[PDB]
Amino acid sequence: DRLFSVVSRGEGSTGKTCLMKAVLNLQDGVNACIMPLLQIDKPLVNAQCTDEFYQGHSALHIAIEKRSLQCVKLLVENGADVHLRACGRFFQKHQGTCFYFGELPLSLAACTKQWDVVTYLLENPHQPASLEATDSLGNTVLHALVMIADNSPENSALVIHMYDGLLQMGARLCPTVQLEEISNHQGLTPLKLAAKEGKIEIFRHILQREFSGPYQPLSRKFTEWCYGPVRVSLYDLSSVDSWEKNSVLEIIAFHCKSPNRHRMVVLEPLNKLLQEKWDRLVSRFFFNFACYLVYMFIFTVVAYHQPSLDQPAIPSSKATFGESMLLLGHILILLGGIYLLLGQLWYFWRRRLFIWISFMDSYFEILFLLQALLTVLSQVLRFMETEWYLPLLVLSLVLGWLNLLYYTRGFQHTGIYSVMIQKVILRDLLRFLLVYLVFLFGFAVALVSDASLELFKFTIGMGELAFQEQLRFRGVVLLLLLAYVLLTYVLLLNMLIALMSETVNHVADNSWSIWKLQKAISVLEMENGYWWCRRKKHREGRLLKVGTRGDGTPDER
Amino acid sequence: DASLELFKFTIGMGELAFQEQLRFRGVVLLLLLAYVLLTYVLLLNMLIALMSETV
Numbered sequence: 001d002r003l004f005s006v007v008s009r010g011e012g013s014t015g016k017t018c019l020m021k022a023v024l025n026l027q028d029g030v031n032a033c034i035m036p037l038l039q040i041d042k043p044l045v046n047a048q049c050t051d052e053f054y055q056g057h058s059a060l061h062i063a064i065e066k067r068s069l070q071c072v073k074l075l076v077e078n079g080a081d082v083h084l085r086a087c088g089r090f091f092q093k094h095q096g097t098c099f100y101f102g103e104l105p106l107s108l109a110a111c112t113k114q115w116d117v118v119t120y121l122l123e124n125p126h127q128p129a130s131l132e133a134t135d136s137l138g139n140t141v142l143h144a145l146v147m148i149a150d151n152s153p154e155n156s157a158l159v160i161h162m163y164d165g166l167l168q169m170g171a172r173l174c175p176t177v178q179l180e181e182i183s184n185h186q187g188l189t190p191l192k193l194a195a196k197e198g199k200i201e202i203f204r205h206i207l208q209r210e211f212s213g214p215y216q217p218l219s220r221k222f223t224e225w226c227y228g229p230v231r232v233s234l235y236d237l238s239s240v241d242s243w244e245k246n247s248v249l250e251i252i253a254f255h256c257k258s259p260n261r262h263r264m265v266v267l268e269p270l271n272k273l274l275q276e277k278w279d280r281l282v283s284r285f286f287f288n289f290a291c292y293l294v295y296m297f298i299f300t301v302v303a304y305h306q307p308s309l310d311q312p313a314i315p316s317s318k319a320t321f322g323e324s325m326l327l328l329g330h331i332l333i334l335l336g337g338i339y340l341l342l343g344q345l346w347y348f349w350r351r352r353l354f355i356w357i358s359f360m361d362s363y364f365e366i367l368f369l370l371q372a373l374l375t376v377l378s379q380v381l382r383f384m385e386t387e388w389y390l391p392l393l394v395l396s397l398v399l400g401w402l403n404l405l406y407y408t409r410g411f412q413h414t415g416i417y418s419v420m421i422q423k424v425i426l427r428d429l430l431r432f433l434l435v436y437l438v439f440l441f442g443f444a445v446a447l448v449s450d451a452s453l454e455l456f457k458f459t460i461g462m463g464e465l466a467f468q469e470q471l472r473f474r475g476v477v478l479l480l481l482l483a484y485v486l487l488t489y490v491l492l493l494n495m496l497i498a499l500m501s502e503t504v505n506h507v508a509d510n511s512w513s514i515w516k517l518q519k520a521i522s523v524l525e526m527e528n529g530y531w532w533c534r535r536k537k538h539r540e541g542r543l544l545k546v547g548t549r550g551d552g553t554p555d556e557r
Numbered sequence: 558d559a560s561l562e563l564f565k566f567t568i569g570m571g572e573l574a575f576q577e578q579l580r581f582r583g584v585v586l587l588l589l590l591a592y593v594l595l596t597y598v599l600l601l602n603m604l605i606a607l608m609s610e611t612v
Contacts, residue, residue: 394585398592420606421599429598453583457574460590464572496598500605 007033015050015057023059023075029068034078042079048086055088056103064109064117072117082106082121082129087136100147103135107144113162122173131174138185141166146194146202151259156201163202171211171218180206187245191238196251200264207235207269222541226554231546235269240277240524241539249524256361262510265517272544274520278410280536282523289407295336296400298329303393312385334379341372343529363425364406371399410519419515423507428499432492439488446481 003011007021010033016024019037037044049057060080063071086103102108106129109117121129134140139147145163149156170179183189188196194203211218222234239248248270252261265271305326307317316323347353354361375396382389408418447455458465467474527535566573575582 391581391585395588398589402592417603417606417610421602424602432598454574456583456587456590460569460593462569462572496601500602504606504609 013051014054015048017044017047019044020047020049020059023062023066023071026066026068026071029066029070031071031074034074038078042081045075045078046081046084049088051088053088053090054086055091056084056086057088057090058084058086058105060105061086061108064105064112064114067112067114069116069120072120076121076124076126079126080105080124082127083133085135092135092137092139100139100144102141102144104133104141104144106130106133107141110141110162110166111144111148113158115162115165118166119169122169128174131170131179132177132182134182136185138183138187140179140182140184140190142179142182142190143184143193146190146199147197149199149202153201160202160205163205167209167211167218168213171213183245188251189245192242192246192248192251195239195248195264196255198252198255198258198261198264200260200267203264204267207267223556224541226556228551228554229547229549231548231550233544233546234541237269237273237539237542239269240273241537243537247524249521253521262517263513265520266513269542270520271516273542274516274523277523277536278519282519282526283410285407285522285526292407293404295333296404299333299393299397299400302326302329302333303390303397306390310387312382312387312389337375337379341376344368344372347529367399367402371396371403409522410515415519416511416515419511419518420507422518423511423514424503427503428496432495432499435495436492439492443485 001011003018004021007018008025011017017037019031019034022031022033045060046058048055058081060072060075063075082105084104090098091103092100102111106118106121109121118129131141145159145166149159170177180190184193186193191203191206194206207220209218209220210222220236222236223232224234225232242248249265252258252264255261265274305322307314309317316327354365360366374392378389378392378396381392405418409415443459444452444455447458454465562573
């Protein structure tokens with residue numbers, strides 16, 4: 001064809017005109033055939049590529065992508081649009097795609113540090129760039145700069161300096177429009193979206209933001225009392241006072257894409273803010289701690305002083321004060337069970353959890369829900385007048401004894417080894433109980449092929465039961481079977497020690513991260529589960545006296 | 558008696574296994590002995606990880 005070869009030397013399925021194909025090659029960075037396209041048909045320079053891949057794409061986007069200047073200066077005198085979307089299947093639907101490169105010449109101009117065409121597209125007398133522009137997802141230019149971030153500090157540095165330079169132009173070219181306030185169609189600011197997808201470097205950059213030059217509502221890290229060896233940091237703290245959109249640890253609690261969710265609480269305003277809120281208010285959880293302890297004492301003395309009889313729901317035997325303490329402890333114990341049960345069903349209907357499909361998230365709530373289910377079947381079964389109530393009351397008892405050690409969450413030694421054993425609940429013993437109950441399955445089948453329960457009681461390892469059956473010769477088949485007991489013995493001790501090689505090597509600082517994460521979530525969840533009234537929601541400042549020695553030049557003006 | 562013999566049941570050297578055919582043994586020592594496994598690997602874990610702490 002003369003068109004594609006004419007744009008090679010000198011279609012309708014992809015919207016590729018001879019100018020579009022003429023931009024698809026750069027060829028020493030020139031395009032000299034723009035004037036006949038001006039003769040034939042701003043609709044050509046802003047033309048959309050027809051294909052499903054590049055739906056909405058124009059040549060100006062390649063003019064950014066070719067990193068040239070002749071393109072962007074001669075693809076703009078014919079009326080180049082800026083506010084135009086380019087959402088297709090080269091774009092933001094699926095993973096493994098050039099996801100959100102910006103769909104927008106200001107955005108993709110601002111992604112790869114092309115400050116000459118950001119500044120140049122901010123100075124064209126055709127259509128100045130909408131900084132507040134957005135897409136069908138609500139993701140603006142800030143969400144473009146945050147969703148492009150990665151774990152590499154080179155990309156973090158170029159994005160943070162092109163980002164802070166974009167804030168420098170936004171404070172110079174088009175001020176008085178709060179671009180950070182603008183949210184997505186999900187309805188989250190780039191503070192809330194950056195903390196949502198877990199970009200601690202740019203959310204940190206929001207928290208570390210201080211603007212040299214005029215004027216004050218662009219900084220976030222404030223200093224009011226200057227001193228040499230003593231720094232006084234102030235913060236507006238728009239994080240926890242966001243009672244309208246979300247709390248930050250709700251969209252960190254629950255995104256549930258988290259690449260690095262655990263480490264980010266160590267970062268400063270969440271850390272010291274939820275610490276001072278801890279030793280404000282949250283540390284007085286000891287009342288519910290000892291209250292649940294005395295609760296378990298009450299069910300302990302109800303089920304423990306169970307009178308030996310065949311008639312359930314008996315009257316006071318005998319007529320003394322202690323049996324009034326028994327029945328009183330019974331009406332008190334399901335009286336508190338209704339409070340815990342309404343708390344967890346409110347947690348269900350509000351918190352919307354866990355359902356589908358394969359991998360269970362929190363191993364807490366299977367135990368709370370299973371204990372709740374077996375204890376309401378214990379209650380209704382107690383109304384159904386049987387004897388089978390008591391072993392399930394023992395089940396809710398001992399599983400409640402396991403539920404005492406959920407409340408072991410903080411102080412400085414105990415809470416962080418509670419993150420050690422909590423993490424080893426999250427990692428090691430699940431596979432160990434899988435293969436160990438498989439090997440007890442083959443072992444208990446192997447001894448049979450009373451007898452079953454006595455086979456369960458043969459081996460903790462405490463068997464001396466050795467068979468008097470002189471018919472089935474013992475001698476090879478327990479030689480290699482007891483050799484297989486040696487195989488699973490050193491294989492499961494090997495699985496314990498090598499399991500500690502798996503989880504222990506990595507849990508050094510993640511105990512110091514998951515810990516203050518766990519009590520951080522507990523802070524923002526005692527202000528949730530307890531429903532009622534005012535938490536401290538003032539945003540005037542946060543007084544911190546950092547005693548870091550500075551003997552240089554502050555020179556703050 | 559029952560208390561002191563319960564102290565002498567477990568260094569770990571118990572073979573006392575109950576002849577009481579009334580109180581069915583079988584789930585409640587299944588998950589109770591599973592809890593003995595929990596405190597066994599949890600306190601051996603507390604020994605080894607305690608040596609991670611102080612050693």
